[PDB]
Amino acid sequence: MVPKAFQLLVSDTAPDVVVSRVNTTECYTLGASEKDVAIRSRYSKVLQWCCLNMSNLQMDGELYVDFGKLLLKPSVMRKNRRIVSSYTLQQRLQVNHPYTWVPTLPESCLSKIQEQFLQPEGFAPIGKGVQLTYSGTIKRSKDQLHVDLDNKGKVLAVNSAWVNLQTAWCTHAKGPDVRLLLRSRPPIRRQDVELFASTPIIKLADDDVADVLPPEHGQLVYLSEDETRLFERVSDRGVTITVREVKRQPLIILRDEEEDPRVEYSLSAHIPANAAKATDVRAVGLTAFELAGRLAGLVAEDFVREYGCEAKL
Amino acid sequence: EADEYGDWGAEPGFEDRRELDFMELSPGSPRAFQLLHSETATDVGIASIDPSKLPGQSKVKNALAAIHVAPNDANKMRFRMAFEWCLMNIWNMNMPGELNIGAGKALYYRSVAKQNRNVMPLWTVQKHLYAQHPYAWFAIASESNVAAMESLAAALNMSIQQERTTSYKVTIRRMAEFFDCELNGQLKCTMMNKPWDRFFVSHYIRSKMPDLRYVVRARHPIKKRIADAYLEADILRSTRDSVQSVLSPELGDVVYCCERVVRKWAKKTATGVTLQLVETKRTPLIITKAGDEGERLEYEWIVPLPQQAERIDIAALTDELWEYGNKLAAALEEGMEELMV
């Protein structure tokens, strides 16, 4: 019903060449392009096209950027080739999901991020200190709803499954990788918001969570405790960017790939159908990319020191 | 169009279309074309990483993360793949062949000034350059390049072998069929090969002025009676001014001529392969093409294609050939700056 885009934008790669004309129809020679202009070109073009698609579909959207490590399954390589074409690598990643996204960031980096990224930027703290929330995932017959719960566990919000229309993966040697996505939420049908508010999803007991959801109403496949701190920046031209810092610890898990505390930083915005007509999404995308690159460069040293993920070929 | 990148989904059967990613062939004028660059590398390196301390990944002790590759290694790997492919094709045929590394500059041309995008990735450029073959190689050198190449040969312990031998090259056309011919200096008919068929051409575009081109070419077998008749027959008379054709009665007309001062430095490489350094000072003499005129000095590597039975180390041979081509380019570079097209 709608096209979707997948991109693996590895940094420090320049797949393009400048076509420099030389005087003596036309004639030219090839020259080395800049280090990473092509990445920004692809990101901006795909963002603009998919945002146009959304606008013609009067669908809301969100530009979601998070920081973590993208670990490829060892089965991605064929015939044991260390070096492979980027186009082939992307077409291989798309076919069967060999990629594994791990949103994380070292604990000690928080002060450095606040002093050298949040404070120098227009980013200012908002909200009321730190808010504790429970993020849960309810699988159903044909859909996978998401639910937010307060300290008591009451149903704060019910949301439909995120649909990703554009999924980019900025990848860096030393620093944490950056995943950039454009997401949409098909409207929750109204009964569901009611259905899940009345029925107690979870039953708190001395800070221990036991599922009490009626089994016919899906299963609580995923559940986690979240400590959320919000920062916001409303720059000129009426575009807002939000830094959500989440200390997340899962409680009820389905698979053994998500079982540890994790610190996540997410840059988010909004692309309303009406606003996007008068909004240059080019600037929003470029600003998000630049901010992500700056923070990745800031935290690269401590990410390497604490996690040791240094991809050297 | 807009799908020139790996976006907008996964089109089915990508491995079939992208199996020959390192080059560009259109199955049934070189058949095989690849374009390289000294600072551009579409290749991405899949390294080995240790995600022992990640959250959620404490049992997996090995994972893969994509990173950038130095363009030297990516070009090495692409050239090795293309060379292995062309070697496989040659060995499938009975063709004997050779790989020549020539020096010069490559110039292209756009069909129409409109719809010309300033910055494109390599593969679409390769597609455009192989669609109608809109390119031209200009082999250039200087007199200082003579001393530079002499010093390079002395450093590489090259053998002197041939010195300043003079020969000629001519082409005879019957119907549209074309014959290449090599003649000895004293108007002696020497060798009657068929024109070179290049199965693989690589435009390795360096950053600086000197530019390297690797070409793998083979000769079809020559049918006996025509070549034998050509051997004894006098084809090229020489007046005191220049050469002239006396081959009319039983041959098609001559189209091209040339005089070659040839200087060959040969040596055995690290592996069991013999390589040559050919210095060719060519004077066009009689020509029919509007661009051939002008004396041209060329420096080339020439390596005969090793046979299948010899079973030479292909990877090491490719590494040595790339290293020697880079050495040639580096030696020629300091002398080659004044051209500026």
XYZ file of C-alpha atoms in Angstrom:
654
model
C 0.000 0.000 0.000
C 2.993 2.268 0.623
C 6.657 1.995 -0.429
C 9.258 1.387 2.260
C 12.980 2.101 2.210
C 15.935 0.354 3.843
C 19.410 1.897 3.920
C 22.783 0.956 5.393
C 24.705 4.243 5.357
C 28.181 3.261 6.505
C 30.294 6.273 7.433
C 33.633 7.273 5.883
C 32.553 5.911 2.489
C 32.261 7.941 -0.720
C 30.633 5.710 -3.362
C 30.176 8.737 -5.651
C 32.585 10.594 -7.933
C 32.570 14.252 -8.958
C 32.113 14.689 -12.718
C 34.478 17.600 -13.362
C 34.258 18.949 -16.903
C 37.478 19.879 -18.705
C 37.710 22.311 -21.607
C 39.293 21.294 -24.906
C 29.697 17.437 -27.093
C 30.700 17.908 -23.464
C 33.665 16.136 -21.881
C 34.617 15.331 -18.313
C 36.897 13.444 -15.958
C 36.180 11.786 -12.633
C 37.433 13.095 -9.313
C 37.289 12.071 -5.681
C 34.070 13.221 -4.035
C 33.892 14.330 -0.419
C 34.133 11.767 2.368
C 30.477 11.382 3.351
C 28.333 13.686 1.201
C 26.586 10.716 -0.435
C 25.213 9.517 2.916
C 23.521 12.860 3.555
C 22.273 13.018 -0.035
C 20.616 9.595 0.203
C 19.132 10.331 3.619
C 17.697 13.699 2.596
C 16.281 12.447 -0.705
C 14.620 9.390 0.820
C 13.258 11.470 3.711
C 11.735 13.997 1.324
C 10.181 11.338 -0.895
C 8.695 9.286 1.949
C 7.425 12.445 3.661
C 5.716 13.356 0.390
C 4.180 9.872 0.347
C 2.891 10.413 3.889
C 1.512 13.844 2.997
C -0.432 12.395 0.078
C -1.679 9.754 2.546
C -2.497 12.317 5.303
C -0.656 10.121 7.804
C 1.237 11.367 10.836
C 4.870 10.388 11.267
C 7.856 10.599 13.568
C 11.573 10.851 12.849
C 13.098 8.566 15.486
C 16.866 8.382 16.002
C 18.547 6.119 18.542
C 22.116 5.195 19.423
C 23.363 1.642 19.744
C 25.314 -1.146 18.110
C 24.190 -2.864 14.907
C 25.495 -6.440 15.066
C 25.201 -8.485 11.890
C 24.669 -12.223 12.104
C 27.751 -14.227 11.039
C 25.631 -15.805 8.285
C 25.600 -12.521 6.337
C 28.967 -13.293 4.731
C 29.037 -15.548 1.673
C 32.160 -17.523 0.716
C 34.015 -15.770 3.574
C 34.521 -12.371 1.938
C 35.655 -9.610 4.286
C 34.937 -7.021 1.576
C 31.538 -6.785 -0.117
C 29.545 -4.283 -2.157
C 27.262 -1.979 -0.179
C 24.330 -2.600 -2.535
C 24.736 -6.355 -2.105
C 25.074 -5.949 1.665
C 21.818 -3.994 1.879
C 19.955 -6.446 -0.352
C 21.275 -9.264 1.849
C 20.181 -7.555 5.064
C 16.692 -6.906 3.713
C 15.845 -10.479 2.715
C 15.858 -12.352 6.032
C 16.632 -9.975 8.946
C 20.221 -10.968 9.827
C 20.736 -7.669 11.620
C 20.439 -7.210 15.385
C 19.929 -3.742 16.856
C 21.146 -3.196 20.419
C 20.204 0.265 21.739
C 22.781 1.059 24.413
C 25.248 3.670 25.637
C 27.767 3.620 28.513
C 26.553 4.652 31.949
C 29.466 7.023 32.607
C 28.708 9.056 29.465
C 25.593 10.728 30.900
C 27.375 13.688 32.490
C 29.510 14.224 29.390
C 26.430 14.194 27.147
C 24.605 16.675 29.364
C 27.560 19.060 29.681
C 28.863 18.881 26.102
C 25.819 17.969 23.981
C 22.594 18.942 25.771
C 23.816 22.183 27.359
C 25.701 23.631 24.330
C 22.718 22.819 22.134
C 19.380 24.526 22.690
C 18.351 21.332 24.507
C 16.841 22.241 27.881
C 15.317 19.874 30.447
C 11.528 19.624 30.505
C 8.989 17.570 32.408
C 9.102 16.816 36.127
C 12.458 15.257 36.967
C 12.517 11.533 36.205
C 9.277 9.679 35.463
C 8.988 5.922 35.966
C 6.931 4.066 33.362
C 6.309 0.459 32.333
C 6.479 -0.216 28.596
C 4.693 -3.388 27.544
C 3.974 -5.171 24.287
C 0.713 -7.077 23.821
C 0.635 -9.545 20.947
C -2.813 -10.235 19.535
C -4.387 -12.359 16.804
C -3.275 -10.072 13.965
C -1.656 -7.034 15.630
C 1.063 -6.129 18.143
C -0.090 -3.281 20.378
C 2.107 -1.239 22.712
C 0.965 -0.064 26.143
C 2.384 2.385 28.678
C 1.755 2.072 32.414
C 2.266 4.446 35.330
C 3.802 3.585 38.701
C 0.507 1.989 39.752
C 0.339 0.196 36.399
C -2.765 1.888 35.002
C -2.995 2.048 31.214
C -1.516 5.438 30.346
C -1.586 5.011 26.568
C -2.344 2.381 23.928
C -0.584 2.615 20.566
C -0.648 0.540 17.406
C 2.378 -1.154 15.887
C 4.994 1.201 14.481
C 5.198 1.048 10.690
C 8.645 2.022 9.429
C 8.533 3.710 6.029
C 12.247 4.595 6.016
C 14.911 2.801 8.056
C 18.513 4.002 7.862
C 21.533 2.605 9.716
C 24.443 4.994 10.094
C 27.411 2.837 11.085
C 30.741 3.910 12.569
C 33.991 2.107 13.315
C 34.685 3.213 16.892
C 31.615 5.092 18.086
C 28.145 3.713 18.652
C 26.073 3.198 15.544
C 23.122 5.485 14.828
C 19.770 4.142 13.649
C 17.467 6.679 11.994
C 13.878 5.781 11.159
C 10.662 7.330 9.915
C 7.693 5.734 11.647
C 3.908 5.931 11.551
C 1.058 4.796 13.795
C -2.178 3.658 12.117
C -5.042 4.995 14.308
C -5.869 2.562 17.208
C -9.487 1.524 16.686
C -11.389 3.141 19.585
C -12.649 0.021 21.410
C -9.056 -1.167 21.876
C -8.061 1.913 23.868
C -11.091 1.215 26.087
C -10.598 -2.564 26.070
C -7.078 -2.332 27.491
C -7.809 0.401 30.039
C -10.539 -1.529 31.867
C -8.752 -4.880 32.066
C -5.743 -4.860 34.434
C -2.770 -5.742 32.238
C -0.342 -6.361 35.114
C -0.606 -7.031 38.851
C 2.059 -5.342 40.964
C 3.193 -7.233 44.070
C 6.090 -5.908 46.199
C 7.648 -4.385 43.061
C 7.277 -7.727 41.243
C 5.110 -7.882 38.125
C 2.885 -10.887 37.417
C 0.812 -10.946 34.240
C -2.956 -10.984 34.779
C -4.052 -10.182 31.228
C -6.905 -12.370 29.950
C -5.139 -14.835 27.637
C -7.668 -14.349 24.829
C -6.583 -10.684 24.673
C -3.144 -11.586 23.368
C -0.057 -12.133 25.492
C 2.268 -9.712 27.280
C 5.246 -10.676 25.148
C 7.482 -7.795 26.274
C 7.548 -5.619 29.386
C 10.152 -3.252 30.792
C 10.648 -0.633 33.493
C 11.556 2.780 32.078
C 13.080 5.842 33.729
C 12.474 8.680 31.270
C 14.051 12.140 31.180
C 12.852 14.555 28.500
C 14.729 17.469 26.947
C 13.263 19.664 24.232
C 14.382 22.251 21.696
C 12.015 24.325 19.566
C 14.281 25.909 16.970
C 13.302 28.564 14.452
C 10.876 27.727 11.607
C 8.647 25.795 14.042
C 10.421 22.420 14.181
C 10.784 20.675 17.539
C 13.360 18.043 18.502
C 13.113 16.016 21.713
C 15.916 14.134 23.473
C 14.396 11.228 25.398
C 16.847 9.497 27.741
C 15.474 6.146 28.914
C 17.068 3.866 31.485
C 15.263 0.637 30.612
C 15.345 -2.707 32.420
C 13.194 -5.520 30.986
C 11.102 -7.673 33.311
C 9.067 -10.019 31.087
C 10.930 -11.074 27.943
C 10.252 -13.510 25.113
C 13.759 -14.104 23.724
C 17.200 -14.154 25.322
C 18.546 -11.250 23.231
C 17.082 -8.546 25.533
C 17.800 -9.274 29.193
C 20.024 -6.469 30.527
C 19.705 -2.837 31.638
C 20.253 -0.365 28.820
C 20.606 3.414 28.539
C 18.977 4.805 25.395
C 19.069 8.300 23.906
C 16.503 9.118 21.230
C 16.108 12.230 19.090
C 12.493 12.549 17.979
C 10.441 14.999 15.942
C 7.045 15.157 14.243
C 6.038 15.371 10.585
C 2.316 16.254 10.573
C 0.549 16.039 7.231
C -0.571 19.676 7.353
C 2.670 21.060 8.799
C 4.987 19.193 6.415
C 3.572 21.181 3.488
C 5.056 24.365 4.980
C 7.996 22.530 6.602
C 11.320 21.830 4.884
C 11.963 18.274 6.073
C 15.426 18.586 4.512
C 16.531 20.853 7.358
C 14.995 18.591 10.012
C 16.743 15.518 8.638
C 20.098 17.256 8.280
C 19.865 18.676 11.809
C 19.009 15.259 13.242
C 21.889 13.631 11.361
C 24.377 16.280 12.483
C 23.263 16.046 16.119
C 23.515 12.257 16.018
C 27.010 12.475 14.562
C 28.115 14.989 17.186
C 26.856 12.886 20.089
C 28.340 9.709 18.611
C 31.703 11.438 18.304
C 31.380 12.660 21.886
C 30.656 9.205 23.329
C 32.874 7.130 21.007
C 35.880 7.090 23.345
C 33.986 5.862 26.400
C 31.925 3.447 24.297
C 35.162 1.844 23.110
C 36.652 1.910 26.614
C 33.687 0.235 28.312
C 32.351 -2.035 25.557
C 35.442 -2.770 23.456
C 33.506 -2.861 20.166
C 36.253 -1.638 17.829
C 35.674 -3.010 14.324
C 39.121 -3.167 12.694
C 39.461 -4.790 9.274
C 16.256 6.516 -12.254
C 15.476 6.777 -8.543
C 16.366 3.115 -7.845
C 20.092 3.544 -8.531
C 20.845 2.693 -4.878
C 19.993 -0.209 -2.607
C 16.799 1.426 -1.357
C 13.043 1.080 -1.876
C 12.898 -2.539 -0.757
C 14.623 -5.735 -1.820
C 14.058 -6.624 -5.460
C 13.834 -10.404 -5.975
C 16.822 -12.398 -7.163
C 19.395 -9.711 -6.405
C 22.208 -12.276 -6.259
C 21.595 -13.274 -9.886
C 21.855 -9.689 -11.132
C 24.601 -8.636 -8.698
C 26.791 -11.746 -8.948
C 29.143 -9.848 -11.281
C 29.190 -6.654 -9.246
C 32.946 -6.107 -9.679
C 32.477 -5.570 -13.439
C 29.805 -5.082 -16.109
C 29.007 -7.611 -18.851
C 26.099 -7.661 -21.283
C 25.585 -11.264 -22.469
C 25.210 -11.797 -26.197
C 34.338 -3.341 -28.226
C 35.385 -5.064 -24.993
C 32.948 -7.527 -23.458
C 34.040 -6.855 -19.863
C 34.361 -3.368 -18.379
C 35.219 -2.117 -14.899
C 35.951 1.377 -13.589
C 38.039 2.008 -10.482
C 39.245 5.010 -8.483
C 42.123 5.887 -6.175
C 39.928 7.531 -3.516
C 36.446 6.089 -4.208
C 35.470 2.621 -2.969
C 31.891 1.344 -3.116
C 33.064 -1.716 -1.174
C 32.268 -2.016 2.535
C 34.238 -4.220 4.916
C 32.598 -6.764 7.196
C 34.866 -6.906 10.243
C 34.838 -9.272 13.219
C 33.645 -7.790 16.511
C 33.436 -9.012 20.113
C 30.018 -8.088 21.592
C 30.756 -9.728 24.935
C 29.772 -6.791 27.163
C 26.675 -5.494 25.363
C 23.272 -5.526 27.082
C 21.334 -8.528 25.823
C 24.421 -9.982 24.086
C 26.507 -11.820 26.679
C 26.504 -15.342 25.195
C 27.433 -14.386 21.617
C 31.218 -14.088 21.349
C 31.434 -13.166 17.652
C 29.512 -10.689 15.509
C 30.002 -8.686 12.325
C 29.983 -4.895 11.975
C 30.243 -3.067 8.649
C 32.931 -0.387 8.293
C 34.767 1.553 5.602
C 37.657 0.076 3.624
C 40.733 1.881 2.387
C 40.191 2.241 -1.387
C 43.515 0.508 -2.072
C 42.288 -2.805 -0.645
C 38.841 -2.515 -2.240
C 40.404 -1.879 -5.648
C 42.784 -4.790 -5.048
C 39.884 -7.138 -4.315
C 37.799 -5.945 -7.271
C 40.756 -6.272 -9.648
C 41.493 -9.747 -8.283
C 37.893 -10.837 -8.842
C 37.868 -9.479 -12.395
C 41.241 -11.080 -13.149
C 40.105 -14.460 -11.825
C 36.923 -14.218 -13.900
C 38.786 -13.365 -17.106
C 41.331 -16.112 -16.404
C 38.482 -18.601 -16.023
C 37.005 -17.488 -19.345
C 40.379 -17.674 -21.106
C 41.052 -21.166 -19.758
C 37.552 -22.210 -20.817
C 38.581 -21.078 -24.282
C 41.751 -22.234 -25.991
C 42.798 -18.597 -26.340
C 46.277 -17.541 -25.260
C 46.297 -14.063 -23.844
C 48.113 -11.346 -21.959
C 47.466 -8.509 -19.523
C 48.885 -5.061 -20.269
C 49.070 -2.175 -17.804
C 49.133 1.048 -19.793
C 49.657 4.626 -18.655
C 47.760 7.691 -19.787
C 44.568 9.626 -19.147
C 40.950 8.656 -19.788
C 38.446 11.149 -21.189
C 34.716 10.583 -21.578
C 31.858 12.533 -23.138
C 28.195 13.056 -22.298
C 25.724 12.568 -25.138
C 23.632 15.663 -24.346
C 24.494 18.593 -22.085
C 21.100 18.270 -20.367
C 20.208 15.755 -17.640
C 23.872 15.689 -16.585
C 24.181 15.078 -12.844
C 27.420 16.339 -11.328
C 27.904 13.574 -8.733
C 27.087 9.894 -9.446
C 28.106 6.566 -7.898
C 30.518 4.315 -9.749
C 28.144 1.614 -10.990
C 25.829 3.910 -12.954
C 28.899 5.569 -14.486
C 30.126 2.106 -15.495
C 26.740 1.327 -17.037
C 26.785 4.555 -19.044
C 30.413 4.067 -20.123
C 29.764 0.466 -21.215
C 26.408 1.096 -22.925
C 27.898 2.742 -26.036
C 31.604 2.753 -25.075
C 31.858 6.584 -24.906
C 35.457 6.882 -23.731
C 38.970 7.416 -25.036
C 42.418 6.606 -23.652
C 45.268 9.044 -24.341
C 48.659 7.471 -23.666
C 51.163 10.252 -22.959
C 54.752 10.450 -21.703
C 57.747 12.802 -21.653
C 61.505 12.640 -22.125
C 62.096 12.980 -18.382
C 59.851 9.923 -18.086
C 62.620 8.030 -19.898
C 65.087 8.719 -17.086
C 62.406 8.084 -14.459
C 61.537 4.681 -15.937
C 65.232 3.838 -16.298
C 65.716 4.543 -12.591
C 62.604 2.499 -11.772
C 63.913 -0.456 -13.783
C 67.332 -0.203 -12.135
C 65.718 -0.166 -8.685
C 63.512 -3.153 -9.550
C 66.581 -5.142 -10.738
C 64.999 -5.356 -14.191
C 66.904 -6.987 -17.026
C 67.915 -4.875 -20.012
C 66.892 -7.543 -22.602
C 65.840 -5.755 -25.830
C 67.234 -2.302 -26.641
C 65.828 0.233 -29.110
C 64.477 -2.273 -31.644
C 62.504 -0.790 -34.544
C 59.370 -2.448 -35.923
C 56.132 -1.577 -37.706
C 52.431 -2.338 -37.281
C 49.882 -2.328 -40.104
C 46.284 -3.407 -40.643
C 44.783 -4.900 -43.806
C 40.998 -4.887 -44.428
C 39.249 -7.449 -46.685
C 35.476 -6.951 -46.976
C 34.882 -5.671 -43.427
C 37.163 -8.402 -41.994
C 40.273 -6.921 -40.355
C 43.865 -8.275 -39.972
C 46.546 -6.896 -37.677
C 50.122 -7.376 -38.834
C 53.575 -6.818 -37.339
C 56.541 -6.207 -39.641
C 60.278 -6.153 -39.052
C 62.245 -2.935 -39.422
C 63.740 -3.698 -42.840
C 60.330 -3.996 -44.542
C 60.159 -7.678 -43.580
C 56.771 -9.281 -42.966
C 57.016 -10.938 -39.551
C 53.798 -11.949 -37.765
C 50.192 -12.221 -38.936
C 48.041 -12.371 -35.797
C 44.357 -11.548 -35.692
C 43.402 -8.264 -33.986
C 43.467 -8.321 -30.193
C 40.167 -9.131 -28.503
C 40.063 -7.517 -25.057
C 37.805 -9.501 -22.745
C 38.380 -7.144 -19.807
C 39.218 -3.434 -19.624
C 39.712 -1.579 -16.332
C 39.899 2.212 -16.062
C 41.753 2.629 -12.781
C 41.431 6.411 -12.379
C 44.156 7.678 -10.063
C 43.943 11.004 -8.245
C 46.966 12.616 -9.885
C 47.803 13.119 -13.550
C 49.141 9.613 -14.420
C 46.404 7.044 -14.949
C 46.566 3.245 -15.147
C 44.549 0.933 -17.401
C 44.637 -2.856 -17.045
C 43.490 -4.798 -20.107
C 43.294 -8.563 -20.613
C 43.346 -9.453 -24.303
C 43.565 -12.657 -26.320
C 44.149 -13.474 -29.987
C 41.995 -15.847 -31.997
C 43.814 -18.590 -33.914
C 44.915 -17.488 -37.381
C 43.860 -19.698 -40.274
C 46.956 -21.124 -41.871
C 46.824 -20.412 -45.601
C 46.076 -16.672 -45.413
C 48.800 -16.030 -42.838
C 51.301 -18.103 -44.821
C 50.454 -16.223 -48.022
C 50.924 -12.930 -46.179
C 54.300 -13.979 -44.754
C 56.211 -14.130 -48.045
C 54.157 -11.547 -49.951
C 55.550 -8.014 -49.951
C 52.908 -5.737 -48.434
C 54.760 -2.570 -47.347
C 57.091 -0.817 -49.762
C 59.124 2.136 -48.480
C 59.776 5.272 -50.464
C 62.357 7.660 -49.039
C 59.537 9.803 -47.632
C 57.395 7.179 -45.874
C 55.800 3.741 -46.256
C 53.409 2.747 -49.049
C 51.125 -0.156 -49.942
C 52.070 -2.805 -52.507
C 49.628 -5.371 -51.102
C 46.628 -4.473 -53.285
C 46.386 -7.434 -55.728
C 45.489 -10.177 -53.218
C 44.696 -8.236 -50.027
C 42.222 -5.650 -48.945
C 43.483 -2.108 -48.590
C 45.806 -1.046 -45.793
C 44.104 1.148 -43.198
C 46.676 1.794 -40.483
C 50.454 2.029 -40.282
C 52.980 2.775 -37.550
C 56.659 2.723 -36.670
C 57.673 1.519 -33.211
C 60.873 2.054 -31.262
C 60.535 -0.723 -28.680
C 62.570 -1.153 -25.489
C 61.729 -4.142 -23.282
C 62.879 -4.752 -19.702
C 61.948 -8.260 -18.566
C 62.132 -9.993 -15.202
C 60.734 -12.948 -13.296
C 58.327 -11.855 -10.570
C 58.149 -13.245 -7.040
C 55.925 -16.028 -8.361
C 56.715 -18.086 -11.447
C 55.607 -15.451 -13.968
C 57.653 -13.416 -16.448
C 56.767 -9.729 -16.777
C 57.954 -7.134 -19.284
C 58.211 -3.341 -19.364
C 57.617 -2.135 -22.919
C 58.631 1.397 -23.886
C 57.058 2.184 -27.263
C 57.849 5.359 -29.193
C 55.261 5.132 -31.966
C 55.064 7.342 -35.059
C 51.698 7.040 -36.852
C 53.044 7.254 -40.447
C 50.087 6.424 -42.747
C 46.756 6.675 -40.915
C 43.068 6.977 -41.721
C 41.658 7.868 -38.276
C 41.514 11.579 -37.485
C 42.963 11.176 -33.983
C 45.898 8.832 -34.532
C 48.393 11.452 -35.735
C 51.237 12.543 -33.482
C 54.217 10.664 -32.075
C 53.239 8.960 -28.814
C 55.518 7.552 -26.113
C 53.991 4.765 -24.018
C 55.197 2.800 -20.998
C 53.417 -0.482 -20.329
C 53.594 -3.608 -18.244
C 52.976 -6.809 -20.200
C 52.369 -10.181 -18.544
C 51.503 -13.291 -20.589
C 48.496 -15.051 -19.128
C 49.678 -18.079 -17.112
C 48.322 -21.397 -18.316
C 45.903 -23.513 -16.305
C 48.404 -26.359 -15.922
C 51.027 -24.041 -14.418
C 48.695 -23.445 -11.439
C 50.287 -20.182 -10.341
C 49.126 -18.445 -7.159
C 46.476 -16.114 -8.561
C 46.091 -13.956 -5.443
C 49.826 -13.341 -5.035
C 50.179 -12.662 -8.762
C 47.352 -10.114 -8.631
C 48.897 -8.427 -5.592
C 52.282 -8.225 -7.324
C 50.733 -6.833 -10.515
C 48.813 -4.162 -8.595
C 51.944 -3.235 -6.643
C 54.025 -2.963 -9.817
C 51.359 -0.896 -11.564
C 51.290 1.468 -8.597
C 55.098 1.664 -8.661
C 54.992 2.526 -12.370
C 52.387 5.225 -11.757
C 54.329 6.685 -8.826
C 57.560 6.796 -10.830
C 55.827 8.456 -13.785
C 53.879 10.907 -11.615
C 56.693 13.293 -10.675
C 57.471 13.833 -14.349
C 53.792 13.914 -15.334
C 52.314 17.187 -14.100
C 52.531 19.582 -17.059
C 49.819 17.976 -19.196
C 46.764 19.547 -17.469
C 44.727 18.381 -20.512
